Amino acid sequence: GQQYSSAPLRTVKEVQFGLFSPEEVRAISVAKIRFPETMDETQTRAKIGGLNDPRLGSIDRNLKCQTCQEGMNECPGHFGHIDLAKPVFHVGFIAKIKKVCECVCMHCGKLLLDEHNELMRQALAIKDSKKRFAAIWTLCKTKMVCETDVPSEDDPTQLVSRGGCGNTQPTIRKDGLKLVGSWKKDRATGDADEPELRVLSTEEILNIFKHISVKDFTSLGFNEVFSRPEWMILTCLPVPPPPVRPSISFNESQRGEDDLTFKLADILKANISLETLEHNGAPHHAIEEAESLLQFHVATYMDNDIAGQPQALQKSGRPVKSIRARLKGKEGRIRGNLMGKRVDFSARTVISGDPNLELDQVGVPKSIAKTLTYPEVVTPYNIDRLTQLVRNGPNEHPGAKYVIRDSGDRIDLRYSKRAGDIQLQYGWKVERHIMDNDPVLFNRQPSLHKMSMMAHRVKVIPYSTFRLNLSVTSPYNADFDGDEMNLHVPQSEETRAELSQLCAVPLQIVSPQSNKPCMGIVQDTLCGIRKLTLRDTFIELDQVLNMLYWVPDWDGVI
Amino acid sequence: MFFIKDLSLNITLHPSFFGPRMKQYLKTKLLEEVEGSCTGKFGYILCVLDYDNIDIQRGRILPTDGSAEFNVKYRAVVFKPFKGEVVDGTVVSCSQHGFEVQVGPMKVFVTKHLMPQDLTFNAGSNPPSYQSSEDVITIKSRIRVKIEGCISQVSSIHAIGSIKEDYLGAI
Amino acid sequence: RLVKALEDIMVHYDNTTRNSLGNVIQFIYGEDGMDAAHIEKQSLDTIGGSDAAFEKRYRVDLLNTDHTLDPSLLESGSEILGDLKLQVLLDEEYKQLVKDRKFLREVFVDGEANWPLPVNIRRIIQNAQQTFHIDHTKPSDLTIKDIVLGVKDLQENLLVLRGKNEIIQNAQRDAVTLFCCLLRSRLATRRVLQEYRLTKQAFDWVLSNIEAQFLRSVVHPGEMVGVLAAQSIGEPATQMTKKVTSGVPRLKEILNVAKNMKTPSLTVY
Amino acid sequence: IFVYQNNITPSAMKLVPSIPPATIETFNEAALVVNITHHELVPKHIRLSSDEKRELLKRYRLKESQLPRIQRADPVALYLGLKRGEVVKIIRKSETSGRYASYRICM
Amino acid sequence: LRFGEMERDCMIAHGAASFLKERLMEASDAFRVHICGICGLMTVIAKLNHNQFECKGCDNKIDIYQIHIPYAAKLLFQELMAMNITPRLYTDRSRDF
Amino acid sequence: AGRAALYKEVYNVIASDGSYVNYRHMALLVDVMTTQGGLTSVTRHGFNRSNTGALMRCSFEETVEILFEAGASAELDDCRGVSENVILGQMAPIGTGAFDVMIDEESLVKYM
Amino acid sequence: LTCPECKVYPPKIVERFSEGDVVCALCGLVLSDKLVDTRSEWRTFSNDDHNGDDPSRVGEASNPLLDGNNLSTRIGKGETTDMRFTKELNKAQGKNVKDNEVQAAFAKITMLCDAAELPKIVKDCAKEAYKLCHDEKTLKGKSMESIMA
Amino acid sequence: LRMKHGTYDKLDDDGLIAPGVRVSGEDVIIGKTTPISSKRDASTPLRSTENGIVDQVLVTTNQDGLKFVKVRVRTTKIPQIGDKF
Amino acid sequence: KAIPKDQRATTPYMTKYERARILGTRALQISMNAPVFVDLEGETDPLRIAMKELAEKKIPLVIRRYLPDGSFEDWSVEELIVDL
Amino acid sequence: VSTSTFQTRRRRLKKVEEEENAATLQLGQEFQLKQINHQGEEEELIALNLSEARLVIKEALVERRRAFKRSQKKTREKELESIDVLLEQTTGGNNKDLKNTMQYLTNFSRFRDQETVGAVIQLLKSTGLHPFEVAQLGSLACDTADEAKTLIPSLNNKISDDELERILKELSNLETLY
RNA sequence: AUAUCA
Ligand SMILES: [Mg+2]
Ligand SMILES: [Zn+2]
Ligand SMILES: [Zn+2]
Ligand SMILES: [Zn+2]
Ligand SMILES: [Zn+2]
């Protein structure tokens, strides 16, 4: 199992999205992360106080997880940080950063328009956090001067002074990960003709953002607590723990590291390099050359599929699996590990029809029944029966696979020396085989219907196919040309009730799709039904008696 | 000081206790958990008031487990000390460093240095005492202290205090 | 896309269809507050036929020797002739039936009679007939008041919305409108006696059953009507093979709110 | 209301919100040749009073957010001269219930 | 087998709330973390044995809860964090409506 | 009228194939596209750009570009959508989970 | 691992991989439940995916015996790529780069084995013999084309 | 370490089953260890869903001379229920 | 806020979902050796026990019916009509 | 699991300011003047002078002993022994804090009888002084209006020297003659 | 990654 914690169990009621304040990234962190080395204390078999577990997460079936201990199947893994040499853009915002610069003064950090402009006070009024930022921008982008005095809220003759600074605002454009401005200028009233062309440094953008008023940035999307605009530009880098980027130690000359561990090491190496350059005699242009390398590695780590930029590739020619790309597609973490996931107590095989099964039942192959299990609680009502299936064991049909004690530890009836002399106690759980009349979820994929997943009664049968009643064919959209179907087993009394009480086959007969029956008589039975019911059709006594007896609820009246 | 505070505690009752002596066991477990307790937020939770009217409310059954969880809303007498609070207490311990004073549930310690200069340590006494020109402070003596500051320490709150200023000291 | 757009839609305990924002999508599920499984195509008689054919079917005139209910129809037949007080009630009855006819002709402009509605009234009558071994010879033990008022009363018990206030009460009236036109058409005095030949107990039973069935017929708060609707359009789209863009590629145009559509056309009447 | 043949200069249009609490509306004569409200597909919209609105929201336990919205520029919202915040009660025929009442708040 | 997106939908259509929870939790992913009550993060150094709690940086050795979420979400959350985004998890509400 | 035309159109696509879908289903879709005040499409642009929860929107099509924006706008997901509780592995607030269940000690002590 | 209940010195335990459990063969107590497929897990590091479509492929295998632990990607052309930024970011890797270049003497051994028709196991021994003796003071100043020979 | 729960008895001391022995699920056809230090188990078991009799077993070296061994397993599949035609 | 019993306006009838959940919950509790409020007339399956308890309205549970605003109406299983 | 209050405030991400607790009448968030009882009603802070407190606890444990025997059906040095007996009956016994508290309270209470604590409570709660001062005035025996204003510094300009000195006189007069 | 299955 997973051991007990005195902590109160609660449910998640709200999720508060935001950006990481570098102060916080530093504060959470449990390790510095100084070296691009994985482990190998120079040709050794232990992690290096530098990258993965410098003080961090734990792996390799070993507890050591900084006092926390626990090890793998309990430790969530805790974060490290990396201190970046110079600020870099977070690839995802790069544009929100650009837009914020476009809205504010690149010298004083004040909104280019305010309460004095009518269109502004109107857009400022917008309740929607995103729509107001959207409107504020289309207005402020155009404004290329920080105004000192603006016409009063009555007369355009006597101009009232707002905030100071007269400075000209650059025309910002992106040059992939870089933001470069083009200042309008003045020179003999004309100029530009040929303006001031300079790239805006992370550090300068950071400083303006630091000076943006709480009231101002709050008028823009931003929140003073959870997401200040200064927190978009990366200064400190949260380093994810091994769980997020697993390693594998094959055979002493084979070892596999995750693409992130590679990408991190490049960030680090590029960092260590640029740190040495700034410390030493800064050659200006050899530094900004090393900065836009760091910028690339950090950027390409969160996103490798960047438009305009070259991909970071991994020796074999394949591009590095960035973080973005793990979340993204179907088969991503969202579409494929959360919104849908493979499951245990599942079973699949070829389906075949049966005129002798009842509408709501499902023929389950003995082998499938002998694998799938229901955890039943030992109770005065079942105690004797359960003890017998336990005695029967994992190989006999109505048998069991495991016994779950109060203590939490699982007894494997297949190997336990005490699998014979096993004496049950009320409250224990017997993980017993799936048995005739258990409710089970039966499903035929695609599943574009609620009727594509229905609850059936088990009927353990021989032969390797799932047998279904022919009239239930239509809702699933199944045939027996080589179709396979899925079976899911509920594990709780609650879950079972859900199946039997809401989604059982008989309930599903009249469907709301078209307010009519979604199952009817088909094929042989449809063909035979016409033939039987003609005026011409007469049956002799002998056959009438068999035909009558065949009806399972027949009154006994000829 | 010494407050009456309205408080609530979530209790998780196992199904086996879903008998008629349920409220009785809840009210009991409440008292076991809350009474005696010392928190930073509330101080010493000393005595739960109005036993006969402790609001149990309806307990929500926790889904995968059997157990029900209730938010037992109650009201109790608390003692939360503060810096600047002038308190009266009895000396308990006394050493070359100062003396501890018992103020209800908590101990407030007075440094040799947080007392006037005239009061000096006398080791040569049973029990060890502090001696002024006029006064004698020892294990049984009653003192009026000014709390200089508190430290929220686990299952207690301890504090440092002076008897140097005016209207403080022996009583 | 249909599923992802609708997922969070469901019927709340106020019969309101809302999303994860509590924003009202539909005020009442599918404008009638009924579960789709509990609905069946039924014929609204009143709707069609000649104005004369309607008259023969529905009109009772106790003040005319030819248009009264024959004493063969009910026991009170002889004593009922010329009852001015009773005739006031049959006038209300007929006047409502005429009101209903105009109204239904406004809703279904083509005059289409067959519509999916809850409670198969046709079947309840059929059952009353075998259940009570209805003798298509002997006269009924019903009063005109028994029929007329009985129906009037049953109607007040066909509950979809429960709140005690004009908004919610007017809302209830609204949801129940169409079903009642059907109910009034199938349970008008002349019809009940001449056609159905119901006894008082048979009628009393028919009424209770319409009520019970109707109530069972309402949607259950919790119904995830969002996903239901998505899948109820999704599944059929999966089975899809003037000349205008139709089928799968048109549904694609529709869902996308496609600006530059393939076959734009006006139908000028 | 100002019914104009072809256009109203942006000079003149700037005088529209110049005299409050009074309100000005501009209608292009060409739109009005046909009353859209008379169309098969156009149901009865009814403007609610401040008290009627207050009641709607009270009766359905609503915030103005939660109500379906008629756009300010909507042909019918124009015809009725609806203002932001104002609510309409739409009464449509139903193949389901015969009569269905929906509500729309102004944008 | 994969209890995929389209299967989630059918369960949502049926109204099988608890059957779905089971498929996604008990029958697969399900994991337990300790979160902080101040900054709704998975920061908590649960030394659940010595019964020590701590969320240093918050200096919170008191306001701590435990939650049952699918490990893939514990993962997703750690991933969003590594990417400088904070998915703060709170056990109470503050908005109403 | 936009709603009435939009339904008419949807209805035709189904009935052209000789299929029947009950009104309510098409009505709901038609209504959802409508409610906002215009023609909100069943696309990454339309519905997925509304005020619903961020994890919900992220489960369809725009995923990461939705979660970055969710971060810088400091969004708060109230977790009422089915998507959220599924991601979180909690009992969704749908049918069976649309209400709460309590034991009453009053009624409990009454039956014995 | 050793069963907490039994404890016999040769701890007889089985890995019931199919049920994903680690059992004590004597008492039957399950000693672990989380159990991972190492074959398929190793498929995520060394795959056949060179294109880049596999979502399972998420890491790469390295050789800690021969090149130590030098994790390093390479700036290269992708689908949407300007040939300008590739040059700059590569000209920027030039200033950050002696012994990290003497690894091209492995390219001297590899091109010598392939010219001598030598197997893949010989190159990797010649590369390990050269890495552990090219910086020795015992070899000092021997003919650098005769110490790899 | 980490031995397969399957049986190793059918292996001759060269680590192979002799051809002719009947096998079954989870049983060990080829015994292999990857010494690292004493040594982990790198053996090949027969697919758990199958069974049969070993047909032929051959031992060889390749282009560079790595010892490698191929094992053939023969079964006779008699038409059952879900069998397609 | 909790709606008073005299001001409750939700259905007097139990929803399919409610009934499925009550039966699920009781069966679960019965199965976890909770006290049974009915004569088991030889019954052993906790769902068939649950069905029996609900059949005689001897289930001590209450449905907290939440309204979109957050308020609620509490309804006893004893008081809910079971026409399902 | 620990105890919560009626103070619901949502500290979202924004950790601190936790501004110091002093008798500048700046007590905690928890010991604020505007409190809220379980019935939602805004109710003022309840501060007790050790005597008002002694009586409260005694009352509660006395009433508890009642229910404990009901549910079981089917001179100061003298007060110390009497109380130490009631604690053995109602309290958990492990709760040593209440034992010391009750002893301290018995030995330091200025007013013995409930009647006495009544008048104290009247006389004082008419000054408009904040519950903290009103308690410290009841629990600290002062003679000079300066003794009071020095020990309870918060009082400073809140009351006249003479008005406070008039109270201090009618407080001394109420002290139960131990 | 190709081939394939309904
Ligand atoms: Mg097929
Ligand atoms: Zn740890
Ligand atoms: Zn400026
Ligand atoms: Zn924290
Ligand atoms: Zn053992």
Side-chain angles (χ1 to χ4, degrees), chain A residues 3 5-10 13 16 18 20 67 74 76-77 335-336 340-343 489 491 498, chain E residues 1-3 5 18-19 22-24 28 32 34 47 51 66 68 74 78 84 86 88 90-91 93:
Chain A
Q3 77 160 132
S5 162
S6 49
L9 186 70
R10 294 257 211 89
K13 308 296 253 78
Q16 242 295 345
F20 248 148
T67 315
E74 188 74 80
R335 293 274 242 106
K341 69 184 76 173
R342 38 182 114 269
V343 304
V489 177
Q491 302 298 285
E498 227 132 286
Chain E
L1 282 133
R2 164 135 190 118
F3 187 85
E5 269 179 296
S18 337
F19 180 84
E22 193 215 68
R23 287 290 100 183
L24 265 32
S28 184
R32 191 267 272 96
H34 286 91
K47 294 182 105 138
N51 224 54
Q66 108 175 46
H68 307 285
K74 169 269 225 223
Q78 269 165 338
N84 219 59
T86 69
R88 267 178 280 247
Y90 291 116
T91 64
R93 11 178 105 262

Coordinates of all heavy atoms in Angstrom, one line a residue, chain A residues 3 5-10 13 16 18 20 67 74 76-77 335-336 340-343 489 491 498, chain E residues 1-3 5 18-19 22-24 28 32 34 47 51 66 68 74 78 84 86 88 90-91 93:
Chain A
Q3 N 1.6 4.4 3.0 CA 1.5 4.5 4.5 C 0.6 5.7 5.0 O 0.5 6.7 4.3 CB 2.8 4.4 5.3 CG 3.7 5.7 5.2 CD 4.8 5.7 6.4 OE1 6.0 6.0 6.1 NE2 4.3 5.5 7.6
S5 N -0.8 9.0 6.8 CA -0.4 10.4 7.2 C -1.5 11.1 8.0 O -2.7 11.1 7.6 CB -0.1 11.2 6.0 OG -0.1 12.6 6.4
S6 N -1.2 11.6 9.2 CA -2.2 12.3 10.1 C -2.8 13.5 9.5 O -3.8 14.0 10.0 CB -1.5 12.6 11.4 OG -0.3 13.3 11.1
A7 N -2.3 14.0 8.3 CA -2.8 15.1 7.6 C -4.3 15.0 7.2 O -4.7 13.9 6.8 CB -2.0 15.4 6.4
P8 N -5.1 16.1 7.4 CA -6.5 16.0 7.0 C -6.7 15.8 5.5 O -6.1 16.5 4.7 CB -7.0 17.4 7.4 CG -5.8 18.2 7.3 CD -4.7 17.4 7.8
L9 N -7.5 14.8 5.1 CA -7.9 14.5 3.8 C -8.9 15.5 3.3 O -10.0 15.5 3.8 CB -8.4 13.1 3.6 CG -8.7 12.8 2.2 CD1 -7.3 12.6 1.5 CD2 -9.5 11.5 2.0
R10 N -8.6 16.3 2.3 CA -9.6 17.2 1.7 C -9.6 17.1 0.2 O -8.8 16.4 -0.5 CB -9.2 18.6 2.1 CG -9.4 18.9 3.6 CD -10.7 19.6 3.9 NE -10.6 20.5 5.1 CZ -10.2 21.7 5.0 NH1 -9.8 22.3 3.9 NH2 -10.1 22.4 6.2
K13 N -10.9 22.4 -4.3 CA -12.1 23.2 -4.6 C -11.8 24.3 -5.6 O -12.7 24.7 -6.3 CB -12.7 23.8 -3.3 CG -12.9 22.8 -2.1 CD -14.0 21.7 -2.5 CE -15.3 21.9 -1.7 NZ -16.2 23.0 -2.3
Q16 N -5.7 28.0 -8.4 CA -5.3 29.4 -8.6 C -4.1 29.5 -9.4 O -3.0 29.5 -8.9 CB -5.0 30.0 -7.2 CG -5.9 31.2 -6.8 CD -5.7 32.4 -7.7 OE1 -4.8 32.5 -8.5 NE2 -6.7 33.3 -7.7
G18 N -1.1 31.1 -11.8 CA -0.2 32.2 -11.7 C 1.2 32.0 -12.2 O 1.4 30.9 -12.7
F20 N 5.5 32.1 -11.5 CA 6.5 31.9 -10.4 C 7.3 33.2 -10.1 O 8.0 33.6 -11.0 CB 7.4 30.7 -10.6 CG 7.1 29.5 -9.8 CD1 7.3 28.2 -10.2 CD2 6.7 29.7 -8.4 CE1 7.1 27.1 -9.4 CE2 6.5 28.6 -7.6 CZ 6.7 27.3 -8.1
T67 N 16.1 13.5 4.7 CA 15.3 13.3 5.9 C 13.9 12.8 5.5 O 13.4 11.9 6.1 CB 15.2 14.7 6.6 OG1 16.5 15.3 6.8 CG2 14.6 14.5 8.0
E74 N 6.3 6.9 -2.4 CA 5.7 7.9 -1.5 C 6.2 9.3 -1.8 O 5.3 10.2 -1.8 CB 6.0 7.5 0.0 CG 5.2 8.4 1.0 CD 3.8 8.0 1.1 OE1 3.5 7.0 1.7 OE2 2.9 8.7 0.5
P76 N 7.0 12.6 -3.5 CA 6.5 13.3 -4.8 C 7.7 13.8 -5.6 O 7.6 13.9 -6.8 CB 5.7 14.4 -4.2 CG 6.3 14.7 -2.9 CD 6.7 13.4 -2.3
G77 N 8.8 14.0 -4.9 CA 9.9 14.6 -5.5 C 9.8 16.1 -5.4 O 8.8 16.7 -5.6
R335 N -4.9 14.8 -22.8 CA -5.7 14.0 -23.6 C -5.5 12.5 -23.3 O -6.4 11.7 -23.5 CB -5.5 14.2 -25.1 CG -5.9 15.5 -25.6 CD -7.3 15.5 -26.0 NE -7.5 15.8 -27.5 CZ -7.9 14.9 -28.3 NH1 -8.1 13.6 -28.0 NH2 -8.1 15.2 -29.6
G336 N -4.3 12.1 -22.9 CA -3.9 10.7 -22.9 C -3.5 10.1 -21.6 O -3.2 8.9 -21.5
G340 N -8.2 10.4 -20.4 CA -8.4 9.0 -20.7 C -7.2 8.3 -20.4 O -6.1 8.9 -20.5
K341 N -7.2 7.1 -19.8 CA -6.0 6.4 -19.4 C -6.3 4.9 -19.4 O -7.5 4.5 -19.3 CB -5.6 6.8 -18.0 CG -6.6 6.4 -16.9 CD -6.2 6.9 -15.5 CE -6.5 8.4 -15.3 NZ -6.2 8.8 -14.0
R342 N -5.3 4.1 -19.5 CA -5.6 2.7 -19.5 C -5.8 2.3 -18.1 O -5.4 3.1 -17.2 CB -4.5 1.9 -20.2 CG -3.1 2.4 -19.8 CD -2.1 1.5 -20.5 NE -1.4 2.3 -21.6 CZ -1.8 2.4 -22.8 NH1 -2.9 1.7 -23.2 NH2 -1.0 3.1 -23.7
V343 N -6.5 1.2 -17.9 CA -7.0 0.8 -16.5 C -6.8 -0.7 -16.2 O -6.7 -1.5 -17.1 CB -8.4 1.2 -16.3 CG1 -8.7 2.7 -16.6 CG2 -9.3 0.3 -17.2
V489 N -14.7 -4.1 -14.8 CA -15.3 -4.6 -13.5 C -15.3 -3.6 -12.4 O -14.3 -3.1 -11.9 CB -14.5 -5.9 -13.1 CG1 -15.0 -6.4 -11.8 CG2 -14.6 -7.0 -14.2
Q491 N -15.4 -2.1 -8.6 CA -14.7 -2.7 -7.4 C -15.4 -2.4 -6.0 O -15.0 -2.9 -5.0 CB -13.2 -2.2 -7.4 CG -12.4 -2.6 -8.6 CD -12.3 -4.0 -8.7 OE1 -11.6 -4.7 -8.0 NE2 -13.0 -4.5 -9.7
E498 N -24.3 1.7 -9.3 CA -24.3 2.7 -10.4 C -24.6 2.0 -11.7 O -25.6 2.3 -12.4 CB -23.0 3.4 -10.5 CG -23.3 4.9 -10.6 CD -22.5 5.8 -9.7 OE1 -22.8 5.8 -8.4 OE2 -21.5 6.4 -10.1
Chain E
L1 N -6.4 -2.0 -20.3 CA -7.0 -1.3 -21.4 C -7.2 0.2 -21.2 O -7.1 0.7 -20.1 CB -8.3 -2.0 -21.8 CG -8.1 -3.2 -22.5 CD1 -9.0 -4.3 -22.0 CD2 -8.3 -3.0 -24.0
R2 N -7.5 0.9 -22.3 CA -7.6 2.3 -22.2 C -9.1 2.7 -22.0 O -9.9 2.3 -22.9 CB -7.0 3.0 -23.4 CG -7.4 4.4 -23.6 CD -6.2 5.3 -24.0 NE -6.6 6.7 -23.9 CZ -6.1 7.6 -23.1 NH1 -5.1 7.2 -22.2 NH2 -6.5 8.9 -23.1
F3 N -9.4 3.3 -20.8 CA -10.7 3.9 -20.5 C -10.5 5.3 -21.0 O -9.9 6.1 -20.3 CB -11.1 3.8 -19.0 CG -12.5 4.3 -18.8 CD1 -13.6 3.4 -18.9 CD2 -12.8 5.6 -18.4 CE1 -14.9 3.8 -18.7 CE2 -14.2 6.0 -18.2 CZ -15.2 5.1 -18.3
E5 N -11.2 9.0 -23.5 CA -12.0 10.1 -23.5 C -13.4 9.8 -23.9 O -14.3 10.1 -23.1 CB -11.5 11.2 -24.5 CG -10.5 12.2 -24.0 CD -10.0 13.1 -25.1 OE1 -9.3 12.7 -26.0 OE2 -10.3 14.3 -25.0
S18 N -19.6 8.2 -9.4 CA -18.7 7.3 -8.6 C -18.1 6.2 -9.5 O -16.9 6.0 -9.3 CB -19.5 6.7 -7.4 OG -20.6 7.4 -6.9
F19 N -18.8 5.6 -10.5 CA -18.2 4.7 -11.4 C -17.0 5.2 -12.1 O -16.0 4.5 -12.3 CB -19.1 4.0 -12.4 CG -18.4 3.0 -13.2 CD1 -18.2 1.7 -12.8 CD2 -17.9 3.3 -14.5 CE1 -17.5 0.7 -13.6 CE2 -17.3 2.4 -15.3 CZ -17.0 1.1 -14.8
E22 N -13.9 6.0 -9.8 CA -13.2 4.7 -9.6 C -12.3 4.4 -10.7 O -11.1 4.2 -10.5 CB -14.3 3.6 -9.3 CG -13.7 2.3 -8.7 CD -14.4 1.1 -9.2 OE1 -14.4 0.8 -10.4 OE2 -15.1 0.5 -8.3
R23 N -12.9 4.4 -12.0 CA -12.1 4.1 -13.2 C -10.8 4.9 -13.3 O -9.7 4.4 -13.6 CB -12.9 4.3 -14.5 CG -13.9 3.3 -14.7 CD -13.3 1.9 -15.1 NE -13.3 1.1 -14.0 CZ -12.7 -0.2 -14.0 NH1 -12.2 -0.6 -15.1 NH2 -12.8 -0.9 -12.9
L24 N -10.9 6.2 -12.9 CA -9.8 7.2 -13.0 C -8.9 7.1 -11.8 O -7.8 7.6 -11.9 CB -10.5 8.5 -13.1 CG -10.7 9.1 -14.5 CD1 -11.0 8.1 -15.7 CD2 -11.8 10.3 -14.4
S28 N -6.7 2.9 -11.5 CA -5.6 3.3 -12.3 C -4.7 4.2 -11.4 O -4.4 3.9 -10.2 CB -6.1 4.1 -13.5 OG -5.1 4.5 -14.4
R32 N -1.7 10.0 -3.2 CA -1.9 10.9 -2.1 C -0.7 12.0 -1.9 O 0.4 11.6 -1.5 CB -2.1 10.2 -0.8 CG -2.6 11.1 0.3 CD -1.5 11.7 1.2 NE -1.3 10.8 2.3 CZ -0.4 9.9 2.4 NH1 0.5 9.7 1.4 NH2 -0.3 9.1 3.4
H34 N 0.5 15.8 0.1 CA 0.3 16.7 1.2 C 0.6 18.1 0.6 O 1.6 18.3 0.0 CB 1.3 16.5 2.3 CG 0.9 15.3 3.1 ND1 1.4 14.0 2.8 CD2 0.1 15.2 4.1 CE1 0.9 13.2 3.7 NE2 0.1 13.9 4.5
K47 N 7.0 14.1 6.8 CA 7.8 13.0 7.4 C 6.8 12.2 8.2 O 7.0 12.0 9.5 CB 8.9 13.7 8.2 CG 10.0 14.4 7.4 CD 11.1 15.0 8.3 CE 12.4 14.2 8.2 NZ 13.5 15.1 8.1
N51 N 5.5 12.1 12.4 CA 4.4 13.0 12.3 C 4.8 14.5 12.3 O 4.2 15.3 12.9 CB 3.4 12.7 13.5 CG 2.0 12.7 13.0 OD1 1.6 12.0 12.1 ND2 1.2 13.5 13.7
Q66 N -4.1 16.8 3.3 CA -3.7 15.7 2.5 C -4.8 15.5 1.4 O -6.0 15.8 1.7 CB -3.5 14.4 3.3 CG -4.6 13.3 3.2 CD -4.1 12.1 3.9 OE1 -3.7 12.2 5.1 NE2 -4.3 10.9 3.3
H68 N -6.4 13.3 -2.4 CA -6.2 12.1 -3.2 C -6.5 12.5 -4.7 O -7.6 12.9 -5.0 CB -7.0 10.8 -2.8 CG -6.8 10.4 -1.4 ND1 -5.7 9.7 -1.0 CD2 -7.6 10.5 -0.3 CE1 -5.8 9.5 0.3 NE2 -7.0 10.0 0.7
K74 N -0.6 15.1 -10.2 CA 0.6 15.4 -9.3 C 1.7 15.7 -10.3 O 2.5 16.7 -10.1 CB 1.0 14.2 -8.4 CG 2.4 14.4 -7.7 CD 3.6 13.8 -8.4 CE 4.5 13.1 -7.5 NZ 6.0 13.3 -7.6
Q78 N 3.5 19.3 -11.1 CA 4.9 19.5 -11.0 C 5.5 20.1 -12.3 O 6.4 21.0 -12.3 CB 5.6 18.2 -10.6 CG 5.8 18.1 -9.1 CD 6.1 16.7 -8.6 OE1 5.8 15.7 -9.3 NE2 6.6 16.6 -7.4
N84 N 7.5 27.6 -14.5 CA 7.2 28.8 -13.8 C 5.7 29.2 -13.4 O 5.5 30.2 -12.8 CB 8.0 30.0 -14.3 CG 8.4 30.9 -13.2 OD1 9.2 30.4 -12.3 ND2 7.9 32.1 -13.2
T86 N 2.1 28.6 -11.3 CA 1.7 28.1 -10.0 C 0.3 27.6 -10.0 O -0.7 28.3 -10.1 CB 2.0 29.1 -8.8 OG1 1.1 30.2 -8.9 CG2 3.4 29.5 -8.7
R88 N -2.0 26.6 -7.7 CA -2.2 26.5 -6.3 C -3.5 25.8 -5.9 O -4.6 26.1 -6.5 CB -2.1 27.9 -5.6 CG -0.7 28.0 -5.0 CD -0.4 29.4 -4.4 NE -0.2 30.4 -5.4 CZ 1.0 31.0 -5.6 NH1 2.0 30.7 -4.8 NH2 1.2 31.9 -6.5
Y90 N -6.4 24.7 -3.4 CA -7.1 25.1 -2.2 C -8.3 24.3 -1.8 O -9.1 23.9 -2.7 CB -7.4 26.5 -2.3 CG -6.1 27.3 -2.2 CD1 -5.7 28.1 -3.3 CD2 -5.3 27.3 -1.0 CE1 -4.6 28.9 -3.2 CE2 -4.2 28.1 -0.9 CZ -3.8 28.9 -2.0 OH -2.7 29.7 -1.9
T91 N -8.4 23.9 -0.5 CA -9.4 23.0 0.0 C -10.7 23.7 0.5 O -11.6 23.0 1.0 CB -8.8 22.0 1.0 OG1 -8.2 22.7 2.1 CG2 -7.6 21.2 0.3
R93 N -13.4 27.4 -0.5 CA -13.7 28.4 -1.5 C -13.7 29.8 -1.0 O -13.7 30.0 0.2 CB -14.9 28.0 -2.4 CG -15.7 26.9 -1.9 CD -16.9 26.6 -2.8 NE -16.7 25.4 -3.6 CZ -16.3 25.4 -4.9 NH1 -16.0 26.6 -5.5 NH2 -16.1 24.3 -5.6

